[PDB]
Motif scaffolding. Structure first.
Motif, PDB file in Angstrom:
ATOM      1  N   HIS B  25     -22.474   5.926  29.000  1.00 14.46           N
ATOM      2  CA  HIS B  25     -20.510   5.910  29.670  1.00 14.46           C
ATOM      3  C   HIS B  25     -20.200   7.240  29.599  1.00 14.46           C
ATOM      4  N   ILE B  26     -18.766   7.437  29.916  1.00 10.78           N
ATOM      5  CA  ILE B  26     -18.009   7.841  30.627  1.00 10.78           C
ATOM      6  C   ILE B  26     -16.437   7.743  30.189  1.00 10.78           C
ATOM      7  N   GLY B  27     -16.187   8.462  28.954  1.00  9.61           N
ATOM      8  CA  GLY B  27     -14.240   8.369  28.583  1.00  9.61           C
ATOM      9  C   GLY B  27     -13.236   9.395  28.910  1.00  9.61           C
ATOM     10  N   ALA B  28     -12.535   8.806  30.259  1.00  6.83           N
ATOM     11  CA  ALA B  28     -12.206   9.883  30.898  1.00  6.83           C
ATOM     12  C   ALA B  28     -10.164   9.846  29.725  1.00  6.83           C
ATOM     13  N   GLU B  29      -9.356  10.673  30.038  1.00 16.00           N
ATOM     14  CA  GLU B  29      -7.972   9.937  28.988  1.00 16.00           C
ATOM     15  C   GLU B  29      -7.373  10.792  29.819  1.00 16.00           C
TER      16      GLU B  29
END
Lengths: 49, 49
Positions: B25-29
């Motif tokens: 996963h990659i979580g960008a905000e």
């Protein structure tokens, strides 16, 4: 007992005076003739370092 | 190798090798404020607009 111009022919090929083996977690006498590679020089000298 | 001693010669050998995947996963905000959102649509009113 024989002269060295037969021993040097003989020392490079024959089985030793029943030497030992590796890898077997103890000192076992050799019985194989296939794999065993060693040539020990404690015979022609007849010594113990 | 097939050689010429008292060893059992070896038959043909074989492998089957089985890989898989993974996941990462990659979580960008991002945040955006409300006064950004509102005046995105209002128009023409003045050179200060």
């Amino acid at each position: 007992n024989r002269g060295l111009y037969t021993l040097v022919n003989e020392y490079s090929a024959r089985l030793a005076g029943a030497p030992a083996t590796s890898t077997t977690d103890l000192q076992y006498v050799v019985v194989n003739g296939t794999d065993v590679f060693l040539d020990q020089p404690c015979h022609m000298l007849q010594e113990a370092y | 190798i097939a050689h010429g001693d008292g060893r059992r010669p070896n038959k043909q050998r074989q492998y089957i090798v089985m890989k898989a995947c993974n996941k990462h996963h990659i979580g960008a905000e991002i945040e955006l404020a409300a006064a950004d959102i509102e005046l995105l649509f209002a128009e023409k009113e003045t050179p200060l607009d």
